[PDB]
């Protein structure tokens, strides 16, 4: 009588009630055992997320889960005989809620305003843009943002004047040849894509003022 942690993906579709694991007492070899569960998610708030089949030991999930609401549950299993006597010590039941990509990346600002001097060499840091994602960035790529430049306005002298660091969001000059009198302002369409570039995209603007030498 011991149970391994239970792993359940959030936003599940059951069908409900969904069997998770069967609790079983070795003492059932001689008498009939009755199972029960207690704890937050079972008999205490949020009540009824989990239930157990009294006569079989089957642990049940009663609804879809939300990792960003509750990521983990700690419950207790109890095994009693018909005489009301406990046949086992309480069993710790851990239920881990695994992540789904249910949040889109969000830029901290719609417009980011930065500046750089006209006589700068390639590799010079311009400004740092930021995007956040509520999903998990540790065990999954759901919370992992990948930064990119979609377009540059204007394309004078050429389209690829700037670069953005894929993970930091730091904008850098990649080509020399900037001039305030020629082009004083650049409107960079910048993107943040979750799942490290394979998920959803969000767009913001980086406005770069070219300062006179």
């Amino acid at each position, epitope marked *: 009588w011991v149970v391994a942690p239970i792993s359940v993906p959030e936003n599940g579709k059951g069908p*409900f*009630p969904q069997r998770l694991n069967q609790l079983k007492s070795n003492k059932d070899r001689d008498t009939k055992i009755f199972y029960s569960i207690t704890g937050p998610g079972a008999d205490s708030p949020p009540e*009824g997320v989990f239930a157990v089949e009294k006569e079989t030991g089957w642990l049940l999930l009663n609804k879809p889960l939300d990792r960003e609401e509750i990521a983990k549950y700690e419950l207790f299993g109890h095994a009693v005989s018909e005489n009301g006597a406990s046949v086992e010590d309480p069993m710790n039941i851990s239920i881990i809620v695994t992540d789904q990509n249910d949040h889109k990346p969000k830029f901290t600002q719609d417009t980011f305003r930065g500046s750089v001097l006209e006589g700068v060499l390639p590799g010079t840091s311009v400004m740092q843009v930021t995007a956040t994602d509520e999903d998990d960035a540790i065990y999954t790529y759901n919370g992992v943002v990948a930064y990119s430049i979609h377009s540059q306005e204007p394309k004078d002298p050429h389209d690829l004047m700037f670069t953005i660091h894929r993970s930091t969001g730091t904008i850098s000059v990649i080509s020399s040849g900037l001039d305030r009198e020629k082009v004083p302002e650049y409107t960079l369409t910048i993107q943040a894509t979750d799942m490290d570039g394979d998920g959803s995209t969000t767009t913001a603007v980086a406005v770069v003022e070219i300062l006179d030498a």
Partner: antibody
Amino acid sequence: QVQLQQSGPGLVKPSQTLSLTCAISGDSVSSQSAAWNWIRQSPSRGLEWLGRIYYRSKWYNDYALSVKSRITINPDTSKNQFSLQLNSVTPEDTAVYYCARGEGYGREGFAIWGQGTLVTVSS
Amino acid sequence: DIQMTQSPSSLSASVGDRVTITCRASQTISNTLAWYQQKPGKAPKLLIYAASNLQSGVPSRFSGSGSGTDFTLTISSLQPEDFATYYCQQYLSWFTFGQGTKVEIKR
């Protein structure tokens, strides 16, 4: 003893919102030993639990998956009542709506019920 | 969800008769079952909970039995005020109800 008194309009037009209230006497909507429910009854689908609210350290709610996208159950502690709000109604929402008290979290059945409010969804 | 199926849909009985109503759950619910009595124009009335526990103030002529998937409500001696529709309800996974058994007067 505990009494539940229902109020609210019966006639709701299709795609419009159904709004009902349940007034409590002899108990508190904020009771730490009760849960407040809405249950409907139609000749077609029978008795159907819609959702509950209950107060412990804070407010909690649970909605039937069938109505989750259209339903709201809210307490009004000052008036000692709780409401039912069901958006975008269709003739399938035609039923007698009941408010009910479940001792604890409802795991001992529903002992106290309101009188019922007939809701007709028609144009 | 768990579906509750009652049997028969209606039955006819006389005053003083022993009446037996059945309820079947689509999956094992052990003892998480309540019984209700409902009269026309009225809200349901709780008779039994935990399959066999008589609700306070309910006459002793009402009794519940069964476990797992199969349940019974018994009225040991049918009284004139007992002619009504009886509903079973599970509370293992949320709250679902049976379709009812109407107990009518035999003549």
